[PDB]
Amino acid sequence: ALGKLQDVVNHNAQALNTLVKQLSSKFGAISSVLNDIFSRLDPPEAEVQ
């Protein structure tokens, strides 16, 4: 019965958790951690990563 409200509570969660899952993607880079990129590579080549 109280579903139309629960959906508003559910989708918002799917709007946040998924937005968190996007932080684990590399987007074509070597990793998803900026510290590991800054420590291994130098800025001249870390800019493109």
């Binding site: 510290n35 590991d36 800054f38 420590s39």
Partner: protein, 49 residues
Amino acid sequence: PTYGVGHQPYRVVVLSFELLHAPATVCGPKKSTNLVKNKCVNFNFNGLK
């Protein structure tokens, strides 16, 4: 010793590294400091900054 630089002998050393999920055993000369807890500090662990 009379040939050109293109034919001169060159000593070459290849240092191959390994980054696995294991207690690291070879790093550089960085003095370790004390562990101060409950304070926002800059942590600089073996492979995590």
